[PDB]
Amino acid sequence: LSDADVQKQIKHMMAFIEQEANEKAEEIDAKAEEEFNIEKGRLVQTQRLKIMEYY
Amino acid sequence: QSQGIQQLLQAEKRAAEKVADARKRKARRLKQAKEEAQMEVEQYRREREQEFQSKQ
């Protein structure tokens, strides 16, 4: 055995951990962008409905 | 292999910190985005109000 082999071995696992975590973080960014656009399509739609009512 | 042990325990913290702070800053991102775009849309609607009032 060798502690270098230990480092590579554990880095397989750290690769999995960090990469899944950061892929989900990128999904959180996808939320911040497109789910933000969806909350726009909802709330601004209600605002626009208000303005038709008023007109 | 102790170097690896400690630095990769540190790597567990990279994943957790980045995910957790991304999640907690998603609230900030969404709230800022609301604060911007929807009020801007409000202002466009009031401009359009002035237009139709001119026609009226």
Added chain:
Amino acid sequence: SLAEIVKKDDFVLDSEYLVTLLVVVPKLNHNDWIKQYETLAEMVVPRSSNVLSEDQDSYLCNVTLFKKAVDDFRHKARENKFIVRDFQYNEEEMRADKEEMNRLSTDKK
């Protein structure tokens, strides 16, 4: 059930991804435990753990591996023919069991 016997620092504190595991028994199989306790499974991290207790027949090693990789640890332990010994990290209930045993001892008197 180890609880009180557990050397508490031998585990990964806040084992969010990396947790310690224990399927290790017969002495007659321990001919290569120096290899196994560091690499029984491929991605083991043994620097921050030790054997919880010693019998003349077995060594109860607290080997480190990942949330999913507990399955791999069990697989290679069973390749070595080891048998259930784990603790699950049950430490607040270790405290509860200490209180219960003390309660029973006092109740005797």
